[PDB]
């Protein structure tokens, strides 16, 4: 029964950026919730990073909504 009060970073440090750029385009389902859970960052910060990766073109859009968005990796072939 450990509490472990989360203290999410408001912006990226050095290790989070390349950890994201090497592991997030190698995952099956990408949503800001699972990005905030795995990378211990804020929800809006994950949304901004995912918008940057969408503008870069390494993530394809699946469906957009005001509640949550759905993202997936590129085909490895």
């Amino acid at each position: 029964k450990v509490r472990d009060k989360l203290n999410n970073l408001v912006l990226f440090d050095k290790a989070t950026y390349d950890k994201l750029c090497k592991e997030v385009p190698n995952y099956k389902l990408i949503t800001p919730a699972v990005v905030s859970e795995r990378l211990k960052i804020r929800g809006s910060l994950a949304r901004a990073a995912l918008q940057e990766l969408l503008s870069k073109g390494l993530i394809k859009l699946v469906s957009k909504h005001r509640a949550q968005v759905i993202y997936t990796r590129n085909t490895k072939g």
């Binding site: 919730a33 905030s36 699946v62 909504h65």
Partner: protein, 191 residues
């Protein structure tokens, strides 16, 4: 041209039911196959008319609970559609097959009845009717996703998505499988 009742973008055919005891109670195949999980009504009027309802419609109707969500059918429908999106993009498997195999795997097949006076603890082992199997299975899936998506950063479109696949493979990391097999354990403990 109505070649196939595509459930938005998923095909209602080529889905396999593994249990024969739930064959006539789950209607998804070739007759009760709709484009939406929202129909008109007059489905809970007589005794067994709810067995003819589509299973995704029953899941959508049982999705809404706890006061502030009653009547919001559109919101539960779009949760169901987004959950089907993560289910299709997550395993590579057709999302209607995942719904069917989870309900079979999460159905409690034996029950204990409270017997005696008020306060005494006596249980008698009975078996569960196949309609009530589907009914408590849908209720268990809905309450597992509901208590997963509470005071958490993870959305309900993802909390519902992880809850069925853990019930589909029988990994027992889901909450429906947890109450299913403790109920089977209680029914087995005193027969």
């Amino acid at each position: 041209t109505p070649d196939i009742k595509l459930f938005g973008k998923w095909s209602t055919d080529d889905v396999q039911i593994n249990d024969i005891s739930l064959q006539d109670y789950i209607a998804v195949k070739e007759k009760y196959a709709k484009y939406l999980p929202h129909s008109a009504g007059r489905y809970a009027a007589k005794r067994f008319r709810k067995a003819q309802c589509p299973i995704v419609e029953r899941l959508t109707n049982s999705m809404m609970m706890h006061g502030r969500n009653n009547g919001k059918k559109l919101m539960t429908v779009r949760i169901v559609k987004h959950a089907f999106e993560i289910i299709h993009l997550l395993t590579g498997e057709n999302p209607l097959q995942v719904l069917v195999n989870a309900i079979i795997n999460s159905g409690p097949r034996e029950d204990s009845t409270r017997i005696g006076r008020a306060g005494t603890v006596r249980r008698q082992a009975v078996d569960v009717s196949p309609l009530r199997r589907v009914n408590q299975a849908i209720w268990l899936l809905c309450t597992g996703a509901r208590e997963a998506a509470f005071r958490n950063i993870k959305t309900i479109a993802e909390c519902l998505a992880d809850e069925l696949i853990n019930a589909a493979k029988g990994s027992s990391n889901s909450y429906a499988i947890k109450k299913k097999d403790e109920l089977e354990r209680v029914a087995k403990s005193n027969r």
